[model samples]
Target: PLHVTFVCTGNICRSPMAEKMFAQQLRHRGLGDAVRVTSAGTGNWHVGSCADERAAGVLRAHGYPTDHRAAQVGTEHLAADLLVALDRNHARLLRQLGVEAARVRMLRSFDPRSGTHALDVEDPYYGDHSDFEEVFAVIESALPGLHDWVDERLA
Candidate 1:
């Protein structure tokens, strides 16, 4: 399987949202058996916790599942075929953690519409309802290209 680990701040928000959505997308595309999806955080404060309620709400409103326990990004995650970063800082952090640039990618980078736009998935932790909705839209926009990228690697 092609392991894809989504990395964000505390594992209770963006990364888990992406992990859930991407897993569903992969299953829909028939890549379910070829790919494995997971998520983690750069900081471990939220470790063993559930995804932030707002994030979970946004996901469930969009028909995605919300069964997850938070985890920290560590050495074991570095070996993933792809390390998907929710923002530029997470990408930099992953690189600093010894993951090659080639393996660490900005989730927004996969969104064709993201060309020339900032590639960071906004942090909605302190934001309101629309914030989570917007984050979900951004992630949804990127899924198609992300799926294609994974397909190419598995080809």
Candidate 2:
């Protein structure tokens, strides 16, 4: 199974949302057990906490499961088959931690059609609920391609 880790500045926001959304997508496609999906923060803040209540509310409202315990990204996470970052900062941080260039990529980079570089899923922790909605939209937009990528590899 492919071990995939989603990363962001704080696990309270983006990464956890992506983790749950991606997991649901995988379960929907019947590939849940074929891949392992998890999230981590580039910083240690919020470790052991559940997704931020705002983030959890947004996810639960969207019908995606919101049960998760947050964690900080560590050198041990370098073992993932893929290290997906929500933005360039997180990507650079992971690279600085010694993850190979080939293993680290912006989550949206997998969207060949998205023509965007240096793109990031904005942090919603400080913003209002609308920010969470927007973040979820961005992640949901990328799900189809992500699912196909994992499916192809698992096949």
Leading candidate by TM-score: 1
- Across 29-128, the per-residue lDDT of candidate 1 in tens digits comes to 8889999999999998999999999999989999999999999997778889999999999999999999998898999988977776548988999997
RMSD values, in order shown: 1.2, 1.3
List where candidate 1 sits over 4 angstroms from the true fold. 116-118
Where does candidate 1 clash, by residue pair? Answer: none
All candidates' TM-scores?
0.95, 0.94
Which 10 successive residues of model 2 have the least lDDT summed?
A: 109-118
Best by lDDT: 1
Q: What is the lDDT of residue 62 in candidate 1?
A: 90
lDDT of 2 by residue, 37-81 (tens): 998998887899988988988998989899889889976577898
Off by over 4 Å in 2: 116-118
Alpha-carbon lDDT, every model: 0.91, 0.85
Ten-residue region with minimum lDDT total, candidate 1: 112-121
